[PDB]
A paper describes a structure:
The new crystal forms of Fcε3–4, P1 and P21 ‘small’ contain three molecules (six chains) in the asymmetric unit (solved at 2.2 Å resolution), and one molecule (two chains) in the asymmetric unit (solved at 2.26 Å) respectively. They therefore offer four additional and unique packing environments for analysis of the intrinsic flexibility of this molecule. A remarkable feature of the carbohydrate attached to chain D in the Fcε3–4 P21 ‘large’ crystal form and chain F in the Fcε3–4 P1 crystal form is that while the terminal units are well defined, there is poor (or absent) electron density at a contour level of 1σ in the 2FoFc map for the first GlcNAc (P21 ‘large’) or first two GlcNAc units (P1), as well as for the covalent connection between these and Asn394. The new structures show disorder in the loops and adjoining β-strands of the region of Cε3 most distant from the Cε4 domains. (The two halves of the Cε3 domain will here be referred to as the Cε4-proximal and Cε4-distal regions; for definition by residue number, refer to Materials and methods). While this has been seen in other Fcε3–4 (and also some IgG-Fc structures), it is particularly marked in the new Fcε3–4 P1 form, and this prompted an analysis of the relative B-factors across all of the Fcε3–4 and IgE-Fc structures, comparing Cε3 with Cε4, and also the Cε4-proximal and Cε4-distal regions of Cε3. The B-factor analysis revealed that the Cε3 domains showed greater intrinsic flexibility than the Cε4 domains in the unbound Fcε3–4 and IgE-Fc structures, despite the range of different crystal packing environments. In contrast, IgE-Fc bound to omalizumab exhibits the most open conformation seen, and is also incompatible with FcεRI binding; IgE-Fc is partially bent in this complex.
Numbering used by the authors:
A (entry chain D): 335 to 362, 369 to 421, 429 to 498, 503 to 544
B (entry chain C): 336 to 422, 424 to 544
C (entry chain B): 338 to 362, 369 to 393, 398 to 421, 428 to 544
D (entry chain A): 339 to 360, 372 to 389, 398 to 419, 430 to 544
E (entry chain E): 336 to 362, 369 to 423, 425 to 454, 457 to 544
F (entry chain F): 339 to 361, 372 to 376, 379 to 381, 383 to 389, 394 to 418, 431 to 454, 456 to 544
The structure:
């Protein structure tokens, strides 16, 4: 009934911002407790609480973790009152392949165009996908990325309006991956016309 | 013990003309007895014979599925089908499924081909964006020489709702040089109840 | 001519019972009590159709203790009083329809209220701890069960914006045999 | 008074009748009326043609007239419920049926058990009342015994309506447990 | 070169109970029928016609099963000629919600005598497939006596057509009742709805 | 393809245009400025204004070839109709029948309180041939209670080159 998940830091937050966070998610007052397997101190975590439209209550705790602490292999635990653990992914690494496409205009969509990005063949599954226009990152809510499925690959989708591509007809799909070289960034550009 | 009940795939419903629903029982720990999967219709009208299937998983968990043929007119005109799971366990489990309601919108199909990737010049990936369809049920096949490729050859994402109403899926197909040099045409075809005239929309993509 | 009893809602919840004399054809509706004790002022409404109605406030204690009120129309004579006999509290059952094709933002809630005696019954629907307007629902007039009780059905169309705000709707029957505050209720949720 | 055929007589029995309740019968098209059955309140029941009624034939009794209701059509939605066990009544259960959003208002409701139609007096159905939008609704109530549901725990509420498809019937089953 | 594949008329499907579909090629062409289910297909009737504009018209009329069509079967027509690639046309039962047609019939006033015009508005039906017949003295008039507009989508979801029937005074003096009748899969219960109209 | 000016533009507006559709140069020839507008197949349209008198004089324009069609003339007959109140009292469908006009070029408008309603308010069929001489068109207009309470009169108007006196024929219909 009451599910619990614990995610790893975003690759964009972990390698670029150097501000990694892990998130413990509880899906139906429950209490969440952070703890480290080493015993070292956990930082103060932010806790959020939101009632969903299906009557579900969702509790999310976001814990800041040390960048070196995460890469050194620390194991963090989330205790709900069921306990979850998260640690870095081991295993082989591989850079991602990025391809960006632009749809032709649908018979109706004369002033809106859809951009798609395929990122595939990367290891492990942890990846961040971003869309940029004029070197400024777009709001995350404007694009929708699938979770990685084993061949790992993700698809990203971004609808752009006529005002944007007429301002500049160039949109960058950027993948931030642990195995991406040389700046943990592999990106592609695409144009509407 | 968890139980799920699917709807017919648009392919089975509109192309194969053999729609089926599947009651999937995932038993976190197999016990001793034989779980009972009983089919019924909310109208009280008869159901057909179902196929039962049991398979123990590598995590020591038992999986029991029952597949029921449903009448094409019956399903389309809004019949509700019911899977009753008697296991042991405390109370009986009851799942039901019916056609999804709401506005209808045909899918838009866009088929792309990734340019050649260094380190593998015999592989090309084909991507298909299918979007702006309502409701969410959709089937995707990839055709070569007007013949349908096996389903395991392609992956399709689960439908997601767009900015407005409407859904989208991506379909990915890895092809080989032997296949595109034999003929450089590949059909991404989407099967959806709202497509006209025969519930299919398709687009041709070429590797070059 | 018809002469109704106070609704259990007005009598027990609002604590302001009234009775209504309806004549289906000026006329003279002289209100009186069988005891000869005074009656209050009444309202009067005459409506030409393609009928004269008059509503009299009555005392709560006066009604509960068995006073008989009379509507003489001039000659038509109708009287009303507290029904007497066996009392039985109402059974309350509330149901939600499943989602019907072509309208996923609408659900109908149904309430069966049965096996109560006497037949005087009121039904309220509550959502978000507060009473929905009476016009939101319809309720059948009491019909005799197979045994000696009565039953009504109450129907309430609800919207997705309401059950996503709070997925709980209460069907509340007001009846004199309900212990101890003259109400029985049952909650129904859409999912 | 002059009634229209019940949807059960019209579409299930296929012998529809109209009754003039207080007598000569006539059709607006001038065609003859069948043999009338007079019964002494005095009523006259006239058999009508099924195709004739559906085609909008106007029958008159004397003067009162009747014809099938015009306007839009809509199939009924059916939902069947069973009440939980009530304390002190372990061997009784009440079944309820909500039939709604149909147009026009003429509708026939039956309850079946083992595909055997229970007698009319076993149940009570309200008269059609208007919904909040367009369309009508009725409620049907059926008390059932322990012996009935222990023999087969399935009861069918069936609605007969002109606009229902394919055979002018929509039904729902309900079980006690 | 273009090809068209029609659905059965509601009249053939529901009144005649002999539904057929037509494959119409316009400019020696070959036409092949099949079913998406793979089930066999009956024998087709082939007809060619020379037109005034010098273009040939080849038609293939295929009888289809009544229960097969109603169950949602898909039928296919394939055309081949000297054209680059084969033309594929497919047809099946129309989907979506169903609504019976609403029929209303008008009689026009006399224009500034020997002839009067009757109009029939049939609207708010789904899907778009509809047949319109005119009756007089309980017998159907020849189809050539009237003309029916092609279905156009109304403001809501439904469709409408108009049907126009010229009548002579010798006809309404014999009897002054003319029946406009729509055949439609959603009409109940016998797939027909009708309205009578008089000149006076 | 090459289209002729609509009777509305020719008579009501007095600024006729022709459109060349390619699924491009204009010639008469005597002496106007052109306007161009851009399934997988691109469709291009170019709209050229023409002099009113010139098209009346029988001038032949080319992109194929178009000109004022010669032939017999016949004015349109107009009948306006209102459906009965449906069992939806805030909406009424209005119908109009235009018939027996030659040639087939015709324009149909609905007017309310002397203002032409937007074209998308009504749905008008293509000119179909009748049994005798002339064509016919049907026009359908859904109206609302707010419209007829302000003025319960709706004009169905046909613009046709053979209509007299001023190329218009109209009939008024009321809801109540
Ligand atoms: C009532 O409604 C509520 C909704 O209001 C619903 O609650 C949902 O419940 C489901 C299931 O219980 C939840 O789904 C789970 O969510 C887990 C957390 O998801 C977050 O984290 C994901 C992991 O992030 C890491 O990995 C990614 C990928 O590399 C990386 O980018 C990150 O930086 C990080 O490293 C993340 O992928 C995910 O983001 C995707 O999805 C969200 C949509 O939720 C979207 O906004 C994003 O843009 C992106 O597309 C998200 O940020 C998740 O880990 C978990 O996934 C595992 O399990 C599923 C099986 O369920 C597997 O299929 C999957 O492959 C993974 O193994 C799972 O998906 C969901 O989060 C709840 N929603 C909310 C808002 O709380 C209730 O269930 C409803 N009740 C009922 C009865 O139905
Ligand atoms: C031991 O190992 C076995 C084998 O993997 C695991 O069994 C799996 O359990 C999961 C979770 O119970 C099952 O996932 C569910 O599958 C349902 C069926 O989906 C199939 O069919 C549909 C259409 O017919 C396809 O689209 C799909 O790809 C599958 O082929 C889904 O309907 C379920 O989704 C619904 O429920 C979930 C949970 O609430 C929601 O998140 C979804 O959004 C949706 O509402 C669900 O995905 C899986 O099918 C099982 N596989 C097998 C082979 O049995 C055991 O779980 C595992 N044991 C342990 C303890 O880990
Ligand atoms: C030389 O002259 C001949 C004789 O007229 C022409 O043949 C016609 O060609 C046109 C196409 O150019 C055909 O038009 C199409 O007809 C299809 C068949 O319709 C049947 O069913 C309808 C009822 O729904 C009947 O009214 C009709 O008579 C037929 O029985 C229609 O399905 C088509 O309409 C739909 O599709 C098109 C798609 O482009 C849309 O534009 C339409 O609006 C509509 O959505 C279409 O109308 C016509 O049927 C042919 N008639 C005959 C007798 O053969 C030649 O075209 C002509 N050649 C040249 C070069 O001019």
């Amino acid at each position: 009934g009451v599910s619990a998940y614990l995610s790893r830091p975003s690759p964009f937050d972990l390698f670029i911002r150097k501000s990694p966070t892990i998130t413990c998610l509880v899906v139906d007052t429950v209490q969440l407790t952070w703890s480290r397997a080493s015993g070292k101190p956990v930082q103060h975590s932010t806790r959020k609480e939101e009632k969903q439209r299906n009557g579900t209550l969702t509790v999310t705790s976001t814990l800041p973790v040390g960048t070196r602490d995460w890469i050194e292999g620390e194991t963090y635990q989330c205790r709900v009152t069921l306990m979850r653990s998260t640690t870095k992914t081991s295993g082989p690494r591989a850079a991602p392949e990025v391809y960006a496409f632009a749809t032709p205009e649908w018979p109706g969509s004369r002033d809106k165009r859809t951009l798609a990005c395929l990122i595939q063949n990367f290891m492990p599954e942890d990846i961040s996908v971003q869309w940029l226009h004029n070197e400024v990152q777009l709001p995350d809510a404007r694009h929708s990325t699938t979770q990685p499925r084993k061949t790992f690959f993700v698809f990203s989708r971004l609808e752009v309006t006529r005002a944007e591509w007429e301002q500049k007809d160039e949109f960058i799909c950027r993948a931030v991956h642990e195995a991406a070289s040389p700046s943990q960034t592999v990106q592609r550009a695409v144009s509407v016309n």
